[PDB]
Protein backbone atom coordinates (compact mmCIF):
# COMPACT_ATOMS: atom_id res chain seq x y z
CA UNK A 1 0.00 0.00 0.00
CA UNK A 2 1.17 3.50 0.83
CA UNK A 3 4.83 2.89 1.65
CA UNK A 4 7.06 5.45 3.31
CA UNK A 5 10.34 3.90 2.27
CA UNK A 6 12.99 5.04 -0.19
CA UNK A 7 13.75 1.89 -2.17
CA UNK A 8 11.84 3.48 -5.04
CA UNK A 9 13.45 6.87 -4.46
CA UNK A 10 16.52 6.98 -6.68
CA UNK A 11 20.04 7.32 -5.32
CA UNK A 12 21.31 10.75 -4.34
CA UNK A 13 23.57 10.53 -7.39
CA UNK A 14 20.65 9.99 -9.73
CA UNK A 15 21.16 6.28 -10.16
CA UNK A 16 18.31 3.81 -10.06
CA UNK A 17 17.93 1.42 -7.13
CA UNK A 18 16.98 -2.18 -7.90
CA UNK A 19 14.49 -3.41 -5.31
CA UNK A 20 14.98 -7.05 -4.33
CA UNK A 21 12.31 -7.32 -1.62
CA UNK A 22 8.64 -6.48 -1.32
CA UNK A 23 6.90 -3.98 0.91
CA UNK A 24 7.22 -4.69 4.63
CA UNK A 25 4.35 -3.72 6.86
CA UNK A 26 6.52 -1.81 9.32
CA UNK A 27 7.04 0.90 6.67
CA UNK A 28 3.48 1.54 5.56
CA UNK A 29 1.57 4.77 5.25
CA UNK A 30 -2.10 5.54 5.66
CA UNK A 31 -4.23 7.99 3.68
CA UNK A 32 -4.37 11.55 5.03
CA UNK A 33 -7.27 12.46 7.27
CA UNK A 34 -7.85 15.77 5.48
CA UNK A 35 -9.87 16.96 8.46
CA UNK A 36 -12.65 19.20 7.21
CA UNK A 37 -14.09 22.04 9.23
CA UNK A 38 -17.75 21.08 9.61
CA UNK A 39 -20.40 23.05 11.49
CA UNK A 40 -21.92 20.55 13.87
CA UNK A 41 -20.86 16.96 14.43
CA UNK A 42 -17.36 15.58 14.92
CA UNK A 43 -16.09 12.45 13.20
CA UNK A 44 -13.17 10.56 14.69
CA UNK A 45 -12.08 7.09 13.57
CA UNK A 46 -9.72 5.14 15.77
CA UNK A 47 -6.78 3.56 13.95
CA UNK A 48 -4.90 0.51 15.19
CA UNK A 49 -1.19 1.23 15.05
CA UNK A 50 2.20 -0.45 15.31
CA UNK A 51 1.91 -1.70 18.87
CA UNK A 52 -1.82 -2.08 19.07
CA UNK A 53 -2.01 1.59 20.04
CA UNK A 54 -4.58 4.13 18.88
CA UNK A 55 -4.38 7.04 16.54
CA UNK A 56 -7.49 9.13 15.95
CA UNK A 57 -8.27 10.30 12.44
CA UNK A 58 -10.27 13.47 12.77
CA UNK A 59 -12.75 13.68 9.92
CA UNK A 60 -15.07 16.69 10.14
CA UNK A 61 -14.05 18.48 13.34
CA UNK A 62 -15.98 21.51 14.60
CA UNK A 63 -13.96 23.08 17.39
CA UNK A 64 -11.42 22.49 20.10
CA UNK A 65 -9.53 23.74 23.12
CA UNK A 66 -7.82 27.05 22.43
CA UNK A 67 -5.32 28.51 24.87
CA UNK A 68 -4.71 32.13 25.82
CA UNK A 69 -1.00 31.79 26.47
CA UNK A 70 -0.44 35.03 28.36
CA UNK A 71 -3.64 34.33 30.31
CA UNK A 72 -3.49 30.52 30.86
CA UNK A 73 -7.14 30.07 29.95
CA UNK A 74 -7.78 27.30 27.41
CA UNK A 75 -11.49 27.50 26.54
CA UNK A 76 -13.35 25.22 24.13
CA UNK A 77 -14.15 27.63 21.37
CA UNK A 78 -15.85 26.27 18.22
CA UNK A 79 -13.64 27.07 15.18
CA UNK A 80 -15.47 29.33 12.71
CA UNK A 81 -13.37 29.15 9.55
CA UNK A 82 -9.92 28.50 8.12
CA UNK A 83 -8.53 31.86 7.01
CA UNK A 84 -4.85 31.33 6.25
CA UNK A 85 -2.54 28.42 5.51
CA UNK A 86 1.22 28.70 5.18
CA UNK A 87 1.74 27.42 1.65
CA UNK A 88 -1.27 26.04 -0.24
CA UNK A 89 -4.59 27.84 -0.56
CA UNK A 90 -6.37 24.66 -1.60
CA UNK A 91 -6.63 23.63 2.05
CA UNK A 92 -7.98 27.08 2.95
CA UNK A 93 -10.60 26.83 0.21
CA UNK A 94 -11.73 23.33 1.14
CA UNK A 95 -11.52 24.17 4.88
CA UNK A 96 -8.98 21.47 5.73
CA UNK A 97 -7.78 21.59 9.33
CA UNK A 98 -4.05 20.86 9.49
CA UNK A 99 -1.57 21.81 12.18
CA UNK A 100 -0.31 25.35 11.95
CA UNK A 101 -3.31 26.58 10.01
CA UNK A 102 -4.83 29.90 11.05
CA UNK A 103 -8.51 29.92 11.96
CA UNK A 104 -11.19 32.28 13.19
CA UNK A 105 -12.74 30.94 16.39
CA UNK A 106 -15.79 32.01 18.40
CA UNK A 107 -14.10 33.76 21.30
CA UNK A 108 -17.24 34.53 23.28
CA UNK A 109 -15.36 32.60 25.94
CA UNK A 110 -12.17 34.47 26.82
CA UNK A 111 -14.65 37.38 26.86
CA UNK A 112 -17.13 36.00 29.35
CA UNK A 113 -14.02 34.55 30.98
CA UNK A 114 -12.33 37.95 30.97
CA UNK A 115 -15.39 39.35 32.71
CA UNK A 116 -15.68 36.54 35.25
CA UNK A 117 -11.97 36.80 36.07
CA UNK A 118 -11.14 40.52 35.92
CA UNK A 119 -14.61 42.04 36.18
CA UNK A 120 -13.86 43.91 32.95
CA UNK A 121 -16.54 44.13 30.27
CA UNK A 122 -14.98 44.28 26.82
CA UNK A 123 -18.08 45.21 24.83
CA UNK A 124 -20.99 47.31 25.98
CA UNK A 125 -23.63 44.54 26.31
CA UNK A 126 -25.24 44.32 22.88
CA UNK A 127 -26.26 39.57 43.31
CA UNK A 128 -22.78 41.05 43.78
CA UNK A 129 -20.11 39.49 45.99
CA UNK A 130 -17.63 41.27 48.24
CA UNK A 131 -14.98 38.58 47.80
CA UNK A 132 -15.52 38.63 44.04
CA UNK A 133 -15.07 42.39 43.84
CA UNK A 134 -11.92 42.03 45.95
CA UNK A 135 -10.44 39.24 43.82
CA UNK A 136 -11.27 40.89 40.49
CA UNK A 137 -9.64 44.13 41.57
CA UNK A 138 -6.62 42.18 42.83
CA UNK A 139 -6.21 40.41 39.48
CA UNK A 140 -6.56 43.84 37.87
CA UNK A 141 -3.84 45.29 40.11
CA UNK A 142 -1.42 42.42 39.46
CA UNK A 143 1.77 43.17 37.54
CA UNK A 144 1.60 41.93 33.96
CA UNK A 145 -2.04 42.91 33.47
CA UNK A 146 -3.19 44.75 30.36
CA UNK A 147 -5.00 43.64 27.22
CA UNK A 148 -3.07 44.27 24.01
CA UNK A 149 -4.40 46.48 21.24
CA UNK A 150 -4.61 43.60 18.76
CA UNK A 151 -6.54 41.25 21.02
CA UNK A 152 -8.98 43.74 22.51
CA UNK A 153 -9.85 45.18 19.10
CA UNK A 154 -11.04 41.62 18.36
CA UNK A 155 -12.71 40.91 21.70
CA UNK A 156 -14.57 44.24 21.44
CA UNK A 157 -16.76 43.43 18.42
CA UNK A 158 -20.15 41.95 19.40
CA UNK A 159 -19.51 38.83 17.30
CA UNK A 160 -16.02 37.82 18.36
CA UNK A 161 -13.93 36.16 15.65
CA UNK A 162 -10.54 35.72 17.25
CA UNK A 163 -7.51 34.51 15.33
CA UNK A 164 -6.10 31.23 16.61
CA UNK A 165 -3.48 28.88 15.22
CA UNK A 166 -4.14 25.15 15.31
CA UNK A 167 -1.49 23.33 17.36
CA UNK A 168 -2.65 19.72 17.43
CA UNK A 169 -2.31 17.32 14.52
CA UNK A 170 -5.99 16.49 13.95
CA UNK A 171 -5.29 13.52 11.74
CA UNK A 172 -3.20 12.02 14.53
CA UNK A 173 -4.91 12.90 17.83
CA UNK A 174 -8.36 13.81 16.51
CA UNK A 175 -8.18 17.27 18.05
CA UNK A 176 -8.29 20.84 16.76
CA UNK A 177 -6.67 22.45 19.78
CA UNK A 178 -4.66 25.60 19.32
CA UNK A 179 -3.57 28.93 20.73
CA UNK A 180 -4.81 32.48 20.21
CA UNK A 181 -2.34 34.64 18.31
CA UNK A 182 -0.71 37.30 20.47
CA UNK A 183 1.53 40.21 19.52
CA UNK A 184 3.86 39.81 16.58
CA UNK A 185 2.37 36.59 15.21
CA UNK A 186 -1.04 38.25 15.37
CA UNK A 187 0.37 41.25 13.50
CA UNK A 188 1.97 38.94 10.92
CA UNK A 189 -1.19 37.02 10.09
CA UNK A 190 -3.43 40.08 10.28
CA UNK A 191 -1.10 41.69 7.75
CA UNK A 192 -1.43 38.65 5.48
CA UNK A 193 -5.22 38.85 5.73
CA UNK A 194 -5.01 42.57 4.92
CA UNK A 195 -2.82 41.86 1.89
CA UNK A 196 -5.21 39.30 0.44
CA UNK A 197 -8.26 41.41 1.26
CA UNK A 198 -6.80 44.33 -0.70
CA UNK A 199 -4.99 42.54 -3.55
Amino acid sequence: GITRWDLHKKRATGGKRHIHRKKRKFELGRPPAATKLVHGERRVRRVRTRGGNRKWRALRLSGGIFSWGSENTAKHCRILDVVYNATNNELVRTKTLVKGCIVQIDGTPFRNWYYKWYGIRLCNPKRVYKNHLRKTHLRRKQKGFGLEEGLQAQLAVPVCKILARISSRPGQDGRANGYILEGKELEFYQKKLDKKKHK
Binding site: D6, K9, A12, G69, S70, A86, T87, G100, K143, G144, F145, E148, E182, G183, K184, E185, F188, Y189
Partner: protein
Protein backbone atom coordinates in the same frame (compact mmCIF):
# COMPACT_ATOMS: atom_id res chain seq x y z
CA UNK B 1 22.34 36.27 4.30
CA UNK B 2 20.70 32.98 5.22
CA UNK B 3 19.03 34.58 8.25
CA UNK B 4 16.38 35.47 5.66
CA UNK B 5 13.52 32.98 5.41
CA UNK B 6 10.13 32.80 3.71
CA UNK B 7 7.35 35.27 4.46
CA UNK B 8 4.62 32.62 4.25
CA UNK B 9 4.72 31.86 7.99
CA UNK B 10 5.80 33.51 11.22
CA UNK B 11 9.02 31.71 12.10
CA UNK B 12 9.29 31.58 15.89
CA UNK B 13 11.52 29.65 18.25
CA UNK B 14 9.86 26.61 19.82
CA UNK B 15 10.68 27.02 23.49
CA UNK B 16 10.31 30.82 23.72
CA UNK B 17 6.84 32.25 24.32
CA UNK B 18 6.94 35.71 22.77
CA UNK B 19 3.81 37.01 24.53
CA UNK B 20 4.80 36.35 28.15
CA UNK B 21 3.52 38.94 30.62
CA UNK B 22 6.19 38.46 33.32
CA UNK B 23 8.98 36.43 31.70
CA UNK B 24 12.17 35.51 33.52
CA UNK B 25 15.77 36.41 32.78
CA UNK B 26 16.73 32.80 32.02
CA UNK B 27 17.13 33.47 28.30
CA UNK B 28 18.05 37.15 28.59
CA UNK B 29 21.60 36.73 27.30
CA UNK B 30 24.58 38.65 28.72
CA UNK B 31 25.17 40.57 25.50
CA UNK B 32 21.71 41.05 24.03
CA UNK B 33 19.28 43.95 24.13
CA UNK B 34 16.80 42.03 26.27
CA UNK B 35 15.94 39.68 23.41
CA UNK B 36 15.07 36.24 24.78
CA UNK B 37 16.45 33.28 22.85
CA UNK B 38 16.44 29.58 23.64
CA UNK B 39 19.82 28.00 22.97
CA UNK B 40 21.83 25.05 24.20
CA UNK B 41 25.47 24.06 24.49
CA UNK B 42 26.13 20.82 22.64
CA UNK B 43 28.67 19.27 24.88
CA UNK B 44 31.33 17.26 23.07
CA UNK B 45 33.97 19.91 23.61
CA UNK B 46 32.33 22.52 21.39
CA UNK B 47 31.54 26.18 22.00
CA UNK B 48 28.20 27.79 21.27
CA UNK B 49 28.81 30.59 18.73
CA UNK B 50 28.03 34.06 20.01
CA UNK B 51 26.22 34.51 16.70
CA UNK B 52 23.87 31.70 17.72
CA UNK B 53 23.38 32.96 21.27
CA UNK B 54 22.85 36.63 20.39
CA UNK B 55 21.38 36.21 16.91
CA UNK B 56 17.89 36.73 15.57
CA UNK B 57 17.75 33.98 12.93
CA UNK B 58 15.31 31.10 13.31
CA UNK B 59 16.57 27.65 12.36
CA UNK B 60 15.22 24.25 13.11
CA UNK B 61 17.99 21.81 12.15
CA UNK B 62 20.34 24.19 13.96
CA UNK B 63 22.29 22.30 16.65
CA UNK B 64 22.48 25.31 19.00
CA UNK B 65 19.03 26.93 18.86
CA UNK B 66 16.78 23.93 18.21
CA UNK B 67 15.88 20.45 19.41
CA UNK B 68 18.49 18.88 17.11
CA UNK B 69 20.88 16.75 19.15
CA UNK B 70 24.45 16.05 18.07
CA UNK B 71 25.24 12.39 18.71
CA UNK B 72 27.23 9.89 16.69
CA UNK B 73 30.23 10.50 14.47
CA UNK B 74 32.01 13.85 14.32
CA UNK B 75 33.99 14.29 11.11
CA UNK B 76 36.27 16.89 9.54
CA UNK B 77 35.93 18.08 5.97
CA UNK B 78 36.27 20.94 3.48
CA UNK B 79 33.40 23.04 2.13
CA UNK B 80 33.34 22.23 -1.59
CA UNK B 81 30.50 24.61 -2.38
CA UNK B 82 27.50 26.40 -0.86
CA UNK B 83 24.75 26.37 -3.49
CA UNK B 84 21.81 25.11 -1.43
CA UNK B 85 19.96 27.19 1.17
CA UNK B 86 21.45 26.54 4.64
CA UNK B 87 22.93 23.29 3.29
CA UNK B 88 26.53 22.97 2.15
CA UNK B 89 28.61 20.32 0.43
CA UNK B 90 31.56 19.03 2.44
CA UNK B 91 34.33 16.77 1.13
CA UNK B 92 36.62 14.38 2.98
CA UNK B 93 39.75 13.55 1.02
CA UNK B 94 41.23 10.52 2.76
CA UNK B 95 43.78 7.87 1.83
CA UNK B 96 42.71 4.24 1.59
CA UNK B 97 45.53 1.73 1.96
CA UNK B 98 45.58 -1.06 -0.62
CA UNK B 99 47.06 -4.15 0.99
CA UNK B 100 48.54 -5.95 -2.03
CA UNK B 101 50.39 -2.96 -3.44
CA UNK B 102 51.65 -1.49 -0.21
CA UNK B 103 50.43 1.99 -1.16
CA UNK B 104 47.50 4.36 -0.73
CA UNK B 105 44.70 5.67 -2.93
CA UNK B 106 43.21 9.13 -3.03
CA UNK B 107 39.51 8.76 -2.24
CA UNK B 108 36.84 11.23 -1.19
CA UNK B 109 33.31 11.46 0.17
CA UNK B 110 30.83 14.31 -0.15
CA UNK B 111 28.25 15.26 2.45
CA UNK B 112 25.26 17.54 2.26
CA UNK B 113 25.80 19.13 5.65
CA UNK B 114 23.57 21.70 7.36
CA UNK B 115 25.21 25.04 8.14
CA UNK B 116 23.26 27.07 10.65
CA UNK B 117 23.15 30.85 10.15
CA UNK B 118 25.46 31.19 13.16
CA UNK B 119 28.60 30.47 11.12
CA UNK B 120 30.66 32.76 8.94
CA UNK B 121 32.36 30.67 6.28
CA UNK B 122 33.93 31.05 2.86
CA UNK B 123 34.13 28.30 0.27
CA UNK B 124 37.15 26.17 1.05
CA UNK B 125 37.12 26.64 4.82
CA UNK B 126 37.53 23.58 6.99
CA UNK B 127 34.57 22.30 8.98
CA UNK B 128 33.94 19.88 11.80
CA UNK B 129 30.43 18.47 11.51
CA UNK B 130 28.62 16.15 13.89
CA UNK B 131 25.92 13.62 13.13
CA UNK B 132 22.28 14.40 13.93
CA UNK B 133 18.94 12.88 13.05
CA UNK B 134 18.06 12.78 9.33
CA UNK B 135 17.09 16.32 8.37
CA UNK B 136 16.47 15.53 4.69
CA UNK B 137 17.12 12.80 2.13
CA UNK B 138 20.90 13.21 2.28
CA UNK B 139 21.43 15.64 5.18
CA UNK B 140 22.20 13.95 8.50
CA UNK B 141 25.09 16.12 9.72
CA UNK B 142 25.21 19.61 11.23
CA UNK B 143 28.20 21.95 11.14
CA UNK B 144 29.59 22.38 14.65
CA UNK B 145 32.70 24.43 13.88
CA UNK B 146 34.04 26.45 10.97
CA UNK B 147 37.82 26.82 10.83
CA UNK B 148 39.24 29.51 8.45
Amino acid sequence: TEVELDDNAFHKQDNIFLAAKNPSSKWVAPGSKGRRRWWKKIGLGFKTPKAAILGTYIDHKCPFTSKVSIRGRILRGIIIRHKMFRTVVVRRNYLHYQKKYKRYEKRHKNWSVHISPAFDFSIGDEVVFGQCRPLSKTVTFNVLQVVP
